[PDB]
Short mmCIF file of C-alpha atoms in Angstrom, two decimals:
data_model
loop_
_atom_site.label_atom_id
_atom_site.label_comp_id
_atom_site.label_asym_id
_atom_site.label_seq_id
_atom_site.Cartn_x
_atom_site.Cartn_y
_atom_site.Cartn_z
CA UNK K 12 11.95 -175.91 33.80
CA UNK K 13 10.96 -179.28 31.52
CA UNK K 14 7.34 -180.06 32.32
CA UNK K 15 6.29 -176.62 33.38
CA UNK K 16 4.63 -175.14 29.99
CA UNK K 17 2.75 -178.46 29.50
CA UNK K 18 1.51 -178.09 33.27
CA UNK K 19 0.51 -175.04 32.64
CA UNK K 20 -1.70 -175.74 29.59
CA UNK K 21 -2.55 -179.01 31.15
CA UNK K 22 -4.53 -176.91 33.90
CA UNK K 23 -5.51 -175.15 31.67
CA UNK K 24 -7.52 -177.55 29.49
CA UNK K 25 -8.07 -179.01 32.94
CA UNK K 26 -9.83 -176.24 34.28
CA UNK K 27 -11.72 -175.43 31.42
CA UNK K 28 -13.05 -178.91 30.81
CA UNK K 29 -14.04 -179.58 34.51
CA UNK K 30 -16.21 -175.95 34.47
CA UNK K 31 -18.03 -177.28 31.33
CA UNK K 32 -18.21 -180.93 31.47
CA UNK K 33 -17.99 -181.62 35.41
CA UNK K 34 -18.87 -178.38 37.65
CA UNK K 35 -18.71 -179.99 40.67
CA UNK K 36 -15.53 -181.68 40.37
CA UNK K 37 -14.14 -178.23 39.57
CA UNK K 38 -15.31 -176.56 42.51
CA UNK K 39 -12.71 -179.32 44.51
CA UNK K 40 -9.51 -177.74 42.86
CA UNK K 41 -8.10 -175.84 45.77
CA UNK K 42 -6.59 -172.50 45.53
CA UNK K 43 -2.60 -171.98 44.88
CA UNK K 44 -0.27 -173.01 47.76
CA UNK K 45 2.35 -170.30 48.56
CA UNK K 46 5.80 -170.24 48.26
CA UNK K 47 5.69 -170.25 51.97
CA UNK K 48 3.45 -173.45 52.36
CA UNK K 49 6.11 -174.56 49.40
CA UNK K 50 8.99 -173.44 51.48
CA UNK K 51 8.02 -175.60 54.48
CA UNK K 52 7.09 -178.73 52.94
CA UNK K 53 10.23 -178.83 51.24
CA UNK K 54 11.98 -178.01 54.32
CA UNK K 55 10.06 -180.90 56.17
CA UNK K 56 10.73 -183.46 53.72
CA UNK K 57 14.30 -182.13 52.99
CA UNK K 58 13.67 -182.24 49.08
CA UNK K 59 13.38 -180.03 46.62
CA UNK K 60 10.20 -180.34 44.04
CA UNK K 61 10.92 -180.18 40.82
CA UNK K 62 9.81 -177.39 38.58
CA UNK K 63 6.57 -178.47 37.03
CA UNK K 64 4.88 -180.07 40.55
CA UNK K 65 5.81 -176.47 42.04
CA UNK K 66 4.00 -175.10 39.10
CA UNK K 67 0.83 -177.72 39.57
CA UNK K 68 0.79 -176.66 43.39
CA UNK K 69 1.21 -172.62 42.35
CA UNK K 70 -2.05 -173.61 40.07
CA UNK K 71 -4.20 -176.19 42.44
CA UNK K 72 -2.89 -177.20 46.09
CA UNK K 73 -4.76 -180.36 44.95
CA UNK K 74 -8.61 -181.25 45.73
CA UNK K 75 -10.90 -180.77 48.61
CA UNK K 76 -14.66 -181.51 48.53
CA UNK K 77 -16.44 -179.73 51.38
CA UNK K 84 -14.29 -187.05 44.32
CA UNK K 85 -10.77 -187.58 42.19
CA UNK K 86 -10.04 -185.20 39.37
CA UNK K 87 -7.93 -188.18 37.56
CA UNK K 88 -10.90 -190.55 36.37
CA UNK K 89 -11.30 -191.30 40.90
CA UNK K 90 -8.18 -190.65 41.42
CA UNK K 91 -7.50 -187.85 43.88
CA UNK K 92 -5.16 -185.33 43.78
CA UNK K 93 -3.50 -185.19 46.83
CA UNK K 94 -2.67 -181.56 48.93
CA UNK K 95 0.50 -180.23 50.20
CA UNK K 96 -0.36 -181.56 52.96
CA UNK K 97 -1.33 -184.74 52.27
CA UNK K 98 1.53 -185.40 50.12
CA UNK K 99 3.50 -184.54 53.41
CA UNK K 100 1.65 -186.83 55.95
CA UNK K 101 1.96 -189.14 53.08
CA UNK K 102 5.81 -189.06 52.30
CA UNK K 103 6.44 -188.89 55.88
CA UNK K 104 4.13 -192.41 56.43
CA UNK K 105 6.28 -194.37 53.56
CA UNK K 106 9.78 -193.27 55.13
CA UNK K 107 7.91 -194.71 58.50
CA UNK K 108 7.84 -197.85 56.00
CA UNK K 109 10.89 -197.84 54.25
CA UNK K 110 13.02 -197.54 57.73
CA UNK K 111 11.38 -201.50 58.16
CA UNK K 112 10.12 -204.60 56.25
CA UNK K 117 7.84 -208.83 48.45
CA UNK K 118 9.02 -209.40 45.10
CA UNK K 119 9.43 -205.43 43.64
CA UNK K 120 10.12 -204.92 39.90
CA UNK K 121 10.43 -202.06 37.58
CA UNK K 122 9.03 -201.32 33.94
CA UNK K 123 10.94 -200.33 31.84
CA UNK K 124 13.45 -202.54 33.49
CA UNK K 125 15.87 -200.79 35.66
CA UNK K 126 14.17 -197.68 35.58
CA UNK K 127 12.88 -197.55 39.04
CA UNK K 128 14.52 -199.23 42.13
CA UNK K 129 12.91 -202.69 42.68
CA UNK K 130 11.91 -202.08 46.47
CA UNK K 131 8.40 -201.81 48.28
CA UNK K 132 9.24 -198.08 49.48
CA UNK K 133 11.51 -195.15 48.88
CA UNK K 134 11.98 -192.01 50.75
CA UNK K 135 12.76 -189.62 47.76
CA UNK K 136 8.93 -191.65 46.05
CA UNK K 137 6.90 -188.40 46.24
CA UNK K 138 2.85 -189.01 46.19
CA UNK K 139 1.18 -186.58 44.51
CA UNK K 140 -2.23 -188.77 43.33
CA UNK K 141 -3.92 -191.03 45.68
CA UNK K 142 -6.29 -194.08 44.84
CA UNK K 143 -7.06 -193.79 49.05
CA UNK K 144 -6.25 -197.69 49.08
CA UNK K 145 -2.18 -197.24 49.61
CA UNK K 146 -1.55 -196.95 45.94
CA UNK K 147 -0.07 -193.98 43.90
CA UNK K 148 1.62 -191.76 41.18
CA UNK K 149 4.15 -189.79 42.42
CA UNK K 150 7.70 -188.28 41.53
CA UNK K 151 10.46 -190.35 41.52
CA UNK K 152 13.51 -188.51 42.76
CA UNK K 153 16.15 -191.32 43.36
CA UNK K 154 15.95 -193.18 39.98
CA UNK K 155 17.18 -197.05 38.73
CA UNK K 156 20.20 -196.57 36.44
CA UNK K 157 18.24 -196.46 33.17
CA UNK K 158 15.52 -193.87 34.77
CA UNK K 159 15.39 -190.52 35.01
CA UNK K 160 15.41 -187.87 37.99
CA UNK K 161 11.65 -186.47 38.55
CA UNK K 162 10.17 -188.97 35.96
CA UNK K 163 6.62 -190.18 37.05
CA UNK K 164 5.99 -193.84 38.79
CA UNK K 165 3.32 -195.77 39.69
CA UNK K 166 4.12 -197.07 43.29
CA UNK K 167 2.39 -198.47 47.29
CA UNK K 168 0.71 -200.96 48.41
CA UNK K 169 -0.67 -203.26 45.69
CA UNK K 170 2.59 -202.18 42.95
CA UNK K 171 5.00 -204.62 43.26
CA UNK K 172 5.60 -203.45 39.65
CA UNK K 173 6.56 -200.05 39.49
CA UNK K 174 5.87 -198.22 36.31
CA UNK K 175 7.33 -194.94 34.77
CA UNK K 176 4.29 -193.53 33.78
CA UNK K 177 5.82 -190.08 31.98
CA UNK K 178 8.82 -188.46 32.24
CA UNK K 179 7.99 -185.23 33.90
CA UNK K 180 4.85 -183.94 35.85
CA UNK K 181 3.81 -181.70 33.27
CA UNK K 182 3.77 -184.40 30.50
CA UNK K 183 1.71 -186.28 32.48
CA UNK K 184 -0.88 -183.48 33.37
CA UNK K 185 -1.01 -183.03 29.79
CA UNK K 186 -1.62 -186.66 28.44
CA UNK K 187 -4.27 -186.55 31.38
CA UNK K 188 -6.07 -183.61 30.10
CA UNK K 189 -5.48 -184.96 26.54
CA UNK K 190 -7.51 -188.10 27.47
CA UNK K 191 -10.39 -185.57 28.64
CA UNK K 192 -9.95 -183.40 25.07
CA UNK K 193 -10.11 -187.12 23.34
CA UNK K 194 -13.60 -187.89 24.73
CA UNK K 195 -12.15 -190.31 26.42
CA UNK K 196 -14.58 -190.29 29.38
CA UNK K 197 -17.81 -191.22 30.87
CA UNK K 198 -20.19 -189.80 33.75
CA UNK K 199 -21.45 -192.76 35.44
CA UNK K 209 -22.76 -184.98 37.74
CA UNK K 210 -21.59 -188.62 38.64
CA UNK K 211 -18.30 -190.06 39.00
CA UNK K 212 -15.97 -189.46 35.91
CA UNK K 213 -14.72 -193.21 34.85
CA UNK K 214 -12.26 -193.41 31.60
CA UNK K 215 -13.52 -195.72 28.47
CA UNK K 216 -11.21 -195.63 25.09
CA UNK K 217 -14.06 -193.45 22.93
CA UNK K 218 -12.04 -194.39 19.26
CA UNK K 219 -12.89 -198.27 20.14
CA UNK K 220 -16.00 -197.30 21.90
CA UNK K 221 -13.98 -199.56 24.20
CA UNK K 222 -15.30 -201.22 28.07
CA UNK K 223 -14.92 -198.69 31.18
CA UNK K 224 -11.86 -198.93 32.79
CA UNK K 225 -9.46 -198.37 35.96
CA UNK K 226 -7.30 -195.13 34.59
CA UNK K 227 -4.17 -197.14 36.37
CA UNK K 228 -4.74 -200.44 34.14
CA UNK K 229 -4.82 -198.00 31.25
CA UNK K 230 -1.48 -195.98 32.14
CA UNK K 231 0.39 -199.20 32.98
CA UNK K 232 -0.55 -200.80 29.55
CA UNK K 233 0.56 -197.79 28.14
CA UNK K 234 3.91 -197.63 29.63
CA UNK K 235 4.16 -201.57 28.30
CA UNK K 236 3.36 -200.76 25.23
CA UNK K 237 5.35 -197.99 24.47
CA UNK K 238 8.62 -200.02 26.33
CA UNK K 239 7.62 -202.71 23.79
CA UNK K 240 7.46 -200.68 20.75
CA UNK K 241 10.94 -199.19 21.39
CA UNK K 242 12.54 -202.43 22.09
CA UNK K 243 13.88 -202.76 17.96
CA UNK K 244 16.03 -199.77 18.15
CA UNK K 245 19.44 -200.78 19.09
#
């Protein structure tokens, strides 16, 4: 149950932003999945998702627009996440240098079958759920991973912290509209736009950094 109260005041402050700030983006938040669209996703990816990204599907079976809800990025459906998860283990059965930060955290390896999607840049890259950690990671902690991450990245350490430090960013005024397409700019430096992955993955390094003196 870690992760589910801060999803569910993430959405929250999520929802209510995106009706003020960004109408159209909120009308792409799809309705609740089912425990029965639940029950056969897990069943056809023999997993079990952890408490707060059943709670974020129960809320929002991610986006469709008759673009991505995290600064481009696009939250991904059930059933993309399935296609998805099913195309990396097509992967990860074949054939890079592969690294983790914080070190050991995340296995140092191109693709994983137990590397959940749940966010989508639609270029092969991701954030997803991490359920076979690195010996210093954790189970269900949040990774950066695909196609142009040869550095993995724990990004938060449940789904519902990182929901939350998402819609914190939005509550921060840490935005722009270029409605137009919601880009993310550091609004305390009145800092240059930038790509929301660059910003969690310096983030991450900083915070690993920072840590580093306790012993």
């Amino acid at each position: 149950n870690d992760g589910v109260s801060e999803t569910l005041l993430a959405w929250r402050h999520i929802d209510f932003w995106t009706s003020e700030h960004n109408p159209d983006l909120n009308a792409t938040l799809s309705d609740p999945c089912t425990q029965n669209d639940i029950t056969h996703a897990e069943e056809d990816l023999e997993v079990s998702f952890p408490n707060p990204v059943k709670a974020s599907f129960k809320i929002h079976d991610g986006q469709e627009d008759l673009s991505g809800l995290f600064y481009g990025f696009q939250l991904m459906t059930l059933d993309q996440v399935v296609a998805m998860t099913q195309a990396w283990r097509n992967v990860a059965k074949n054939l890079p240098d592969q690294k983790s930060i914080p070190p050991n955290a995340v296995q140092p390896v191109y693709a994983h079958p137990a590397w959940i999607p749940l966010i989508t840049d639609n270029a092969g890259n991701h954030i997803g759920v991490d359920l076979a950690p690195g010996p210093n990671g954790k189970y269900a902690q949040i990774i950066t991973f695909g196609r142009d991450f040869d550095t993995k990245f724990v990004i938060a350490e449940n789904w519902g912290e990182f929901l939350l430090s998402f819609a914190n960013d939005l509550e921060a005024g840490n935005w722009y509209l270029v409605d137009g397409e919601l880009v993310f700019r550091d609004k305390k430096s009145n800092g240059p736009i930038q790509d929301y992955f660059e910003v969690l993955k310096r983030r991450t390094w900083i915070k690993y950094q920072l840590e580093r003196p306790h012993r």
